[PDB]
Design a binder for this molecule. Structure first.
Ligand SMILES: CC(=O)Nc1ccc(C(=O)NCCc2c[nH]cn2)cc1OCc1ccccc1
Length: 112
């Protein structure tokens, strides 16, 4: 089916985002932001819906995502949180923009 095939493409993208190829800029997005550990005591006041690649992986493994659009919304939420919280000149934003470039160009190659 179309939904299964498109979710296979989504799973391929997710594997790539977690791969050593992209680790130099992907690593801040591997696990939930530990706001308390990083001293970001305003993070959960500013970010209402935290998202990270480990949460996307768990949701994929649990068959939570019903279609490619739902998967993409979580990956883009993760990037949007980074752009909302951080000043645009911060290193983590540069890393987000590079990983989102990887994501958007491969997401565009969706079979349909
Ligand atoms: C996903 C996300 O937004 N993460 C982060 C947000 C704010 C800070 C944070 O502490 N910001 C203020 C201090 C700072 C600036 N540049 C690095 N640390 C560090 C963050 O992730 C860890 C990190 C560390 C080093 C480089 C990239 C990501």
């Amino acid at each position: 089916g179309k939904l299964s095939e498109q979710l296979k493409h989504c799973n391929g993208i997710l594997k790539e985002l977690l791969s050593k190829k992209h680790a130099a800029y992907a690593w801040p997005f591997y696990k939930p932001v530990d706001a308390s550990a990083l001293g970001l005591h305003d993070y959960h006041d500013i970010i209402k819906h935290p998202m990270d690649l480990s949460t996307v992986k768990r949701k994929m493994e649990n068959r939570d995502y019903r279609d490619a659009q739902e998967f993409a919304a979580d990956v883009r939420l993760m990037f949007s949180n980074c752009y909302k919280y951080n000043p645009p000149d911060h290193d983590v934003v540069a890393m987000a923009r590079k990983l989102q470039d990887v994501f958007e160009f491969r997401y565009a190659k969706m079979p349909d």
